[PDB]
Design a binder for this molecule. Structure first.
Ligand code: CLA
Ligand code: CLA
Ligand code: CLA
Ligand code: CLA
Ligand code: CLA
Ligand code: CLA
Ligand code: CLA
Ligand SMILES: CCCCCCCC(=O)OCC(=C\C=C\C(C)=C\C=C\C=C(C)\C=C\C=C(/C)C=C=C1C(C)(C)C[C@H](OC(C)=O)C[C@@]1(C)O)/C=C/[C@@]12O[C@]1(C)C[C@@H](O)CC2(C)C
Ligand SMILES: CC(/C=C/C=C(C)/C=C/[C@@]12O[C@]1(C)C[C@@H](O)CC2(C)C)=C\C=C\C=C(C)\C=C\C=C(C)\C=C\[C@@]12O[C@]1(C)C[C@@H](O)CC2(C)C
Ligand SMILES: CC(/C=C/C=C(C)/C=C/[C@@]12O[C@]1(C)C[C@@H](O)CC2(C)C)=C\C=C\C=C(C)\C=C\C=C(C)\C=C\[C@@]12O[C@]1(C)C[C@@H](O)CC2(C)C
Ligand SMILES: CC1=C(C/C=C(\C)CCC[C@H](C)CCC[C@H](C)CCCC(C)C)C(=O)c2ccccc2C1=O
Lengths: 153, 80, 30, 162, 147, 34, 72, 171, 130, 223, 73
């Protein structure tokens, strides 16, 4: 159950990373920093010499979008009786049986297909983080390199 | 429930039994004292621990001893 | 000034010490 | 015009036009409900008329002390809230009316406690009814006088326009 | 109303909130626990000692890391009599602008260090914010060993 | 992500989320039955 | 917690229990553990803990702030 | 006449029949409330309660929050809305854990009769006992109640934010 | 006016039993009185006895026993206290053998009796881990 | 009026005497309930009916005390923490969120207008505290209009809260002096007794005297 | 005096009785134990002494503070 849910989230997040790269490349993703006078001192990051560096407005907007998605998730979590697939296991329910090293090759909108794609997406995220840490570039820079240049163009 | 023990220093003066607010102690026949009676604690499940029993004990260091133990809605005196 | 790598690996090592702590906590029983 | 409560000394069972001599019990219950509601509303209206005339602390003064003039000066969004509150109250009264043992004007449910009513209870109900009737006459007179003369109660009295 | 004081059945049968209160205050009195032997007592005390030493080492590692990251140890080395040591930075959303300005030290609001760790670490031969980081790393490793 | 964003990422996380989940777990545990 | 002892807090808690049990819109929620006053020993411990924590905090604040504000 | 009498002719209950506990106004007013209104599923009760509660909860947060504005500010409205939604989330978490630890039933008003008829010689507290016969007193009922409270709270908070914005802008 | 004719003429008090004496246990005290004497309830205020059978319900055994102790001042002795579980599970409690506990009755065995004084109790160090 | 030590001493002394005497009145009400109260002679009268619903009285007084204390004192603490955090505009002050005692100011206005309007035979207000001119004798102020602002609102509600808690302790002592759910025969233990025992979780201070003791403490606080 | 009150308000009778036991042992060892057996103050009297001392100390502190302040200025 946890593996299936995390795979779904990893696939959706690969989509989100592609969208974020597109937005950064295409002039979206607002510029500047948050207004400390408007949002209090908790948005202030540092004061180098007489200027207050605040949280970037782009980071705030991306956090708001992630808050939208996480709120949807929290609603689905506290909506167990009305959702098709629950987040946790009911008392009595038994965990679906592990798929194994290789899940069954069943194309389409099947449990095995979603399982395999979730595993692939989670492995891709692991590899992306490993490449970014080992080489030292930004995550979006690694995605741009791994797409030839068609993302940050 | 609390634990109530009776010791053979009992003189059978009945002051403990008539002081119990929850009917825990009673007087039973005995042959160890002049009165021919000794206190007993057969209903300690109703014991509340107020220790009125040993406030009325005339013997030197008591003949009824209340040892507070596990708590219950009866022993805590909870009307709710 | 310490780098992001220095803080990140210290955080990762701290996580490992956390998993060792719950294992000791659970082994000391419920 | 029955053994109903509300019969006082000056005119016992006051039905000169015989409205109740032919009506059934349901129509008489409706009449009592209407009378009690009118009386209560009129008592409130008379008290408000006078107090507003010599005291209007709300709305930062303003809201001219003459009634029927402040009626057209309230923000009209406070009128809506008063209307909605009265409506909710009367919805609750309608819900009360279907409770078992309901009495025409009894929204407190005194029938639950008052079985075999006393003379004090009947006398107090008659007191409420008579005060309501006097307040109905008084508020009708207030509105008519303010319409024809243009002055309020304590203003017309003070000047001497009697 | 059950299963919290696993070590005491007498408390677990309490129908009142006293069970929760007494469950906290009797958790470390191992000698009074239900189904208790001496061997289990000494073994549990031994394991608790290990966890405690791990906690102490983690606390010291945290002090070292926060001095290395948000402190002014390196600046304090060059002027120990004028520079005030910094314990750690502050991030509190309830601060007003005035509180931020008053607590502002160098780059972020921070707390002066009153533990004397700056002088102690300077005396034993620490001159870099990378020496403190090494100490924090080593102490977390020691905490892992003890756990 | 700079190092100075770590306080704003962690302090709310710890000081609000950890109380919530810890309260959930502790309440569930101390209110269990047998 | 030190001056006022138990017995005075058990009856008050009983009144609160009655109030909760006899009020609509809150009868739907009921406790699993019966609320009772803190025990005598627990009350002594809690009063001692408050006394000690307040003592330590107020003196630490005083000594630190006085030294800092007096000696620059 | 006397307007205070023992409740339901029982002089030993810790209750009284005052002109407030057992008045016709009290009866009707409590019977029109979502918690006691007849003909409502537990999800509907939760949804209505959540709507009303979020609607009146956004108020104090927006008006007196840390980011107030004597004029209308979108940031103040967003702050109040987020605070109200998070408070509703906390309340829903409390409801969920309370229902988890309180009831073990999936269909009430029957199990009581079954154990009053077909005997209940078991561990009790699930077959026997069972406090309350309402549909809100089940594991399924309380779960749907919490779900409705949470969804209705979100919807009511959003509706109240929209109303506040309209009132501050067009008035 | 009241559910049962044998209830004392009590006007009801907000000090009676609560939800506990509907799902855990309730206590009933019965007695017969020659006169409709006015007595004080263990919970609230003044109630009036019935010249005959009297039945009162309480939430605690101590409340029933306090009422019974008050009854002794009215020369009432035949009062009997019962425990009722959530269903009609009646158990006679106070006059357990028909004789008050203060008077010795044959057929009672000593419970909780130690054949020594206090000084004969074992040392706690010898009662460790049992 | 110009001898400030005399005025301060007289006020403080008389308020102290008043508080002590009020606590004594509560104590002797409890003593009457324990000793001289006859249940038979008070069947269904006011005293009986008050005891019959003592729970409701004490529970609602408890709620009122919590409400008043929470509000008054927590507004004080909110002001303190807003000032400590450098947020001066978030206080419950006059130059901030303002709680004007409008009801008391209305009364003050009514009194300063009384001479010639409602007291037509008066030449001056009863007290210059309600308003008027500054009265000085030998360059020392005798009386002067006492302005009421948000500071007086908070302290007046503090007074109300402390008085309510003292009333709560004393009324709980008087009403529960004869019996309770804990001790159904508390009247048989007398007015002055330390406890009933360590049982019932602990029955300290259940007397009615132990309520005049706690009420003395709270009267000291309030005064 | 106000701080003195807290000894009676915070403590209990058993400790003082058991301390008086050892003091009485010393007196008996020196043959000077009084015939009137010394007993610690009863629980109610301990509370009464505590509250009386508390009130006296607090009211006297406020008394001195008020009088000195308002006489000086
Ligand atoms: C904070 C980060 C975060 C983010 C970005 C997401 C993102 C998402 N979650 Mg999610 N979730 C999170 C945290 C998060 N979750 C947590 C912490 C929990 C546990 C409470 C859940 C529990 C959860 C459930 C139970 C469900 C989601 C669902 C979803 C998807 C809804 C988007 C949509 O409608 O697509 C268009 C999306 C993949 C839903 C889904 O699978 O997609 C529709 C769904 O049913 N989430
Ligand atoms: C039919 C009743 C009625 C109506 C329609 C009005 C209408 C009005 N009054 Mg008013 N008033 C009334 C009765 C009424 N009054 C009574 C009885 C009093 C004496 C307390 C007052 C005292 C009063 C003052 C002091 C002021 C007004 C003002 C006003 C005007 C602005 C609205 C406002 O602020 O009300 C304010 C109303 C109150 C403060 C008191 C209302 C109390 C209500 C009537 C009793 C409870 C009603 C309840 C919800 C329903 C009954 C329950 C049950 C019986 C079913 C408006 C024209 C203001 C104005 O501009 O004056 C020109 C103003 O300053 N009124
Ligand atoms: C449930 C609580 C509640 C809330 C939050 C409000 C909120 C409001 N009422 Mg209000 N009102 C309520 C209940 C409530 N009402 C009830 C029960 C009544 C009795 C019928 C009224 C009668 C009432 C009147 C008569 C007036 C208001 C007005 C107002 C507005 C101005 C209040 C203010 O100080 O300015 C911030 C504000 C939108 C005033 C208004 O809208 O004028 C602009 C106005 O004149 N109200
Ligand atoms: C016991 C030692 C200790 C203590 C008291 C603190 C205290 C603090 N740290 Mg911290 N920290 C520590 C060790 C410690 N640190 C270590 C070893 C590391 C390296 C991984 C860090 C890395 C770190 C970062 C990156 C940040 C903080 C921050 C903070 C502050 C806010 C709390 C927070 O967000 O925690 C978050 C802490 C972590 C993510 C690391 C885990 C902390 C240690 C390893 C766990 C110690 C557990 C302890 C022994 C007992 C746990 C009890 C529990 C069961 C309830 C606070 C002053 C924040 C700050 O400076 O805000 C201004 C911040 O952003 N800490
Ligand atoms: C480590 C502990 C900690 C932390 C980090 C915070 C953090 C915060 N507190 Mg807080 N608080 C705490 C402990 C803490 N509190 C305790 C213990 C108390 C009691 C003594 C208080 C009492 C308190 C009060 C009385 C108030 C705060 C407020 C605030 C906010 C600062 C004001 C501001 O500019 O934000 C502005 C806030 C917003 C723009 C919106 C924030 C709403 C929540 C917090 C966002 C959470 C997002 C969450 C992930 C959503 C989940 C998904 C959901 C949609 C389903 C901030 C979020 C103020 C506040 O904002 O009230 C809400 C405020 O009025 N706090
Ligand atoms: C400074 C010490 C102090 C404080 C705070 C209190 C507080 C209180 N006493 Mg008192 N008391 C004291 C000393 C004190 N006492 C002493 C020394 C004695 C010995 C004689 C007594 C004897 C005594 C008796 C005999 C009685 C009280 C009662 C009360 C309560 C009155 C109701 C009320 O205001 O609750 C509101 C609570 C407060 C005002 C405390 C502060 C709360 C803050 C300001 C608001 C909430 C903060 C928030 C929840 C924090 C959340 C964050 C956190 C989780 C981190 C209140 C809890 C009465 C009672 O039971 O209540 C009705 C009562 O009968 N007290
Ligand atoms: C009781 C005392 C009290 C009160 C009234 C307040 C009030 C306030 N504090 Mg505050 N505070 C207090 C004590 C108090 N504080 C204490 C003791 C501390 C220190 C721990 C703080 C620390 C603190 C911080 C750090 C902050 C505040 C802030 C605020 C403001 C916003 C709070 C908020 O979001 O409201 C939320 C309110 C609700 C969710 C509603 C609760 C009240 C409702 C209306 C009750 C309704 C009852 C109703 C009438 C019943 C009848 C219903 C009917 C249908 C029958 C507000 C002015 C914030 C600020 O900046 O504001 C200026 C902020 O950042 N406070
Ligand atoms: C993160 C994105 C990066 C992009 C970069 C910039 C964009 C940005 O900044 O975004 C943030 C942003 C907006 C983000 C909006 C979002 C994410 C909305 C998402 C809504 C999700 C919904 C409805 C989910 C519904 C799911 C359901 C029902 C899920 C479900 C199911 C189904 C479907 C399977 C059916 C099942 O059926 C059964 C059986 O129940 C139930 C359930 C639960 O299983 C605005 C940002 C800024 O406006 C701000 C903040 C400031 C401005 O100045 C600048 C900009 C404009 C940028
Ligand atoms: C979960 C995971 C990734 C999850 C990613 C998610 C949810 C996606 C999130 C996002 O969409 C959001 C939310 C928002 C977007 O803006 C950002 C992203 C990030 C895109 C990776 C796990 C990755 C997990 C990995 C790689 C696990 C490896 C485990 C191994 C090797 C275990 C080995 C052993 O178990 C054996 C074999 C035998 C045992 O006895 C011994 C050991 C050794 C323990
Ligand atoms: C599956 C996936 C993404 C799936 C996305 C899905 C389903 C999106 C579905 C949508 O509905 C949403 C959510 C939202 C809608 O609006 C859009 C659509 C589209 C409708 C990404 C995988 C992404 C997978 C990636 C990036 C994989 C990377 C793998 C690497 C680098 C492997 C390396 C190795 O193979 C070598 C080289 C040698 C080996 O020996 C060793 C290793 C290390 C194993
Ligand atoms: C010290 C103490 C005692 C012992 C106190 C005793 C025995 C009092 C001894 C009083 C002496 C013997 C007489 C008074 C001597 C004073 C010098 C006279 C008073 C001073 C005048 C100016 C009034 C208790 O008995 C006690 C009981 C319950 C709670 C707390 C305590 C408690 O704290």
């Amino acid at each position: 159950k946890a593996e299936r849910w995390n795979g779904r989230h990893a696939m959706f997040g690969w989509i989100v990373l592609l969208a974020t790269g597109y937005a950064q490349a295409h002039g979206l993703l607002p510029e500047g920093g948050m207004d400390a006078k408007e949002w209090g001192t908790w948005v202030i990051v540092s004061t180098t010499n007489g200027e207050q560096v605040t949280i970037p407005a782009a980071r705030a907007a991306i956090a708001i979008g992630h808050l939208h998605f996480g709120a949807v998730g929290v609603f689905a979590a506290y909506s167990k009786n009305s959702v098709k697939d629950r987040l946790l296991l009911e008392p009595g329910e038994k965990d679906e049986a592990p798929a194994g090293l290789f899940p069954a090759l069943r194309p389409g909108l099947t449990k095995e297909a979603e399982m395999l794609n979730g595993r692939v997406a989670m492995l891709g995220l692991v590899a992306l983080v490993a490449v970014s840490a080992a080489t030292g570039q930004d995550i979006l820079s690694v995605i741009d390199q791994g797409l030839g240049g068609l993302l940050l163009k | 429930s609390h634990t109530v023990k009776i010791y053979d220093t009992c003189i059978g003066c009945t002051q403990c039994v008539r002081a119990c607010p929850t009917d825990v102690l009673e007087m039973v026949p005995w042959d160890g004292c002049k009165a021919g009676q000794i206190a007993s604690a057969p209903r300690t499940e109703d014991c509340v621990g107020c220790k009125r029993c040993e406030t009325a004990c005339p013997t030197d260091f008591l003949s009824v001893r209340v040892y507070l133990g596990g708590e219950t809605t009866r022993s805590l005196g909870l009307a709710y | 000034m310490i780098y992001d790598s220095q803080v990140y690996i210290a955080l990762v090592i701290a996580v490992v010490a956390s998993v060792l702590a719950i294992r000791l906590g659970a082994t000391l029983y419920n | 015009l029955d053994g109903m409560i509300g019969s006082s000394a000056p005119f016992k069972n006051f039905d000169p036009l015989g409205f109740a001599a032919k009506a059934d019990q349901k129509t008489l219950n409706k009449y009592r409900e209407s009378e009690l509601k009118h009386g209560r509303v009129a008592m409130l209206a008379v008290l408000g008329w006078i107090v507003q005339e010599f005291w209007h602390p709300l709305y930062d003064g303003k809201l001219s002390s003459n009634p029927l003039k402040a009626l057209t000066e309230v923000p009209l969004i406070g009128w809506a809230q008063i209307f909605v509150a009265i409506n909710v109250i009367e919805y609750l009264q309608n819900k009360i009316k279907e409770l078992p043992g309901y009495r025409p004007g009894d929204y407190l449910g005194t029938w639950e406690w008052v079985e075999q009513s006393d003379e004090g209870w009947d006398s107090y109900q008659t007191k409420e009814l008579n005060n309501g009737r006097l307040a109905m006459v008084a508020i009708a007179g207030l509105i008519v006088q303010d319409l024809i003369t243009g002055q309020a109660a304590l203003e017309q009295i003070t000047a001497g326009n009697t | 109303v059950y299963k919290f004081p696993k070590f005491s059945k007498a408390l677990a049968e309490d129908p009142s909130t006293r069970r929760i209160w007494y469950g906290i205050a009797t958790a470390h009195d191992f000698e009074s626990h239900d189904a208790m032997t001496e061997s289990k007592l000494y073994q549990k005390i031994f394991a608790s000692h290990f966890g405690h030493i791990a906690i102490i080492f983690l606390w010291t590692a945290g002090n070292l890391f926060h001095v290395a990251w948000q402190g002014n140890f390196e600046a304090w080395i060059l002027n120990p009599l004028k520079v005030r040591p910094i314990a750690h930075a502050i991030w509190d959303p309830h601060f007003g602008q005035a509180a931020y300005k008053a607590f502002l030290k160098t780059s972020s609001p921070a707390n002066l260090a009153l533990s004397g760790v700056y002088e102690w670490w300077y005396t034993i031969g620490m001159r870099t914010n990378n020496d403190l980081y090494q100490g924090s790393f080593f102490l977390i490793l020691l905490s892992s060993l003890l756990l | 992500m700079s190092l100075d964003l770590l306080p704003s990422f962690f302090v709310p996380l710890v000081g609000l989320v950890l109380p919530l989940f810890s309260i959930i777990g502790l309440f569930l545990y101390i209110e269990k039955e047998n | 917690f030190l001056i006022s002892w138990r017995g005075y807090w058990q009856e008050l808690i009983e009144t609160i229990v009655w109030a909760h049990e006899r009020t609509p819109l809150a009868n739907l929620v009921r406790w699993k553990d019966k609320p009772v006053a803190l025990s005598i020993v627990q009350a002594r411990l809690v009063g001692l803990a408050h006394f000690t924590i307040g003592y330590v905090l107020t003196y630490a604040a005083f000594v630190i702030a006085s030294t800092i504000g007096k000696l620059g | 006449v006397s307007f205070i009498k023992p409740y339901r002719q029982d002089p030993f209950v810790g209750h009284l029949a005052t002109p407030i506990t057992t008045s016709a106004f009290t009866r009707a007013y409590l019977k029109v409330l979502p918690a006691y209104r007849p003909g409502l599923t537990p999800l509907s009760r939760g949804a209505e309660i959540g709507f009303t509660h979020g609607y009146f909860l956004i108020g104090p947060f927006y008006t007196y929050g840390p980011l107030r504005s004597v004029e209308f500010s979108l940031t103040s409205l967003a702050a109040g809305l987020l605070a109200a939604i998070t408070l509703l989330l906390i309340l829903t978490v409390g409801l969920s854990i309370y229902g988890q630890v309180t009831y073990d039933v999936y269909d009430n008003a029957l199990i009581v009769k079954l154990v009053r008829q077909m005997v209940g010689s078991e561990r009790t507290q699930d077959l026997p006992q069972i406090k309350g016969t309402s549909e809100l007193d089940t594991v399924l009922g309380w779960q749907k109640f919490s779900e409705g409270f949470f969804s209705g709270g979100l919807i009511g908070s959003i509706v109240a934010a929209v109303g506040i914005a309209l009132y501050s802008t067009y008035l | 006016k009241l559910k049962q004719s044998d209830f004392p003429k009590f006007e009801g008090s907000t000090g009676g039993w609560l939800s506990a004496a509907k799902n855990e246990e309730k206590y009933v005290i019965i007695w017969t009185s020659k006169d409709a004497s006015l007595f004080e309830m263990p919970t609230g205020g003044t109630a009036k006895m019935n010249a005959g059978n009297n039945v009162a319900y309480f939430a605690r055994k101590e409340q029933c026993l306090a009422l019974g102790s008050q009854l002794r001042g009215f020369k009432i002795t035949n009062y009997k206290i019962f425990r009722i579980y959530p269903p009609l599970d009646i158990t006679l409690l106070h006059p357990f053998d028909g004789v008050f506990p203060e008077k010795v009755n044959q057929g009672r065995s000593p419970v909780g009796k130690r054949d020594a004084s206090i000084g004969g109790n074992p040392n706690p160090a010898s009662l460790k881990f049992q | 009026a110009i001898d400030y030590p005399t005025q301060l001493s007289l006020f403080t002394h008389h308020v102290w005497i008043g508080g002590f005497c009020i606590v004594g009145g509560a104590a002797h009400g409890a003593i009457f309930f324990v000793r001289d109260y006859n249940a038979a002679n008070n069947y269904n009268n006011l005293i009986d009916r008050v005891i019959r619903h003592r729970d409701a009285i004490i529970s609602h007084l408890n709620w009122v005390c919590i409400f008043l204390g929470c509000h008054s004192f927590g507004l004080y603490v909110h002001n303190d923490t807003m000032r400590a955090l450098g947020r001066s505009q978030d206080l419950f002050s006059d130059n901030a969120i303002a709680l004007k005692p409008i009801f008391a100011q209305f009364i003050q206005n009514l009194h300063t207008l009384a001479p010639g309007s409602t007291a037509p035979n008066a030449l001056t207000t009863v007290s210059y505290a309600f308003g008027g001119d500054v009265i000085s004798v030998g360059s020392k102020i005798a009386m002067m209009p006492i302005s009421l602002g948000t500071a007086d609102f908070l302290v007046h509600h503090i007074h109300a809260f402390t008085i309510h808690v003292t009333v709560l302790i004393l009324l709980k002592g008087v009403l529960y002096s004869r019996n309770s759910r804990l001790i159904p025969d508390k009247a048989n233990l007398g007015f002055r007794f330390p406890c009933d025992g360590p049982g019932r979780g602990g029955t300290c201070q259940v007397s009615a005297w132990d309520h005049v003791f706690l009420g003395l403490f709270w009267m000291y606080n309030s005064i | 005096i106000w701080a003195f009150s807290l000894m009676f308000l915070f403590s209990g009778r058993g400790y003082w009785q058991e301390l008086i036991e050892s003091i009485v042992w010393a007196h008996n060892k020196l043959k000077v134990a009084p015939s009137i057996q010394p007993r610690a103050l009863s629980i109610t009297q301990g509370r009464a002494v505590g509250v009386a001392h508390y009130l006296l100390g607090g009211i006297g502190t406020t008394w001195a503070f008020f009088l000195a302040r308002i006489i000086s200025v």
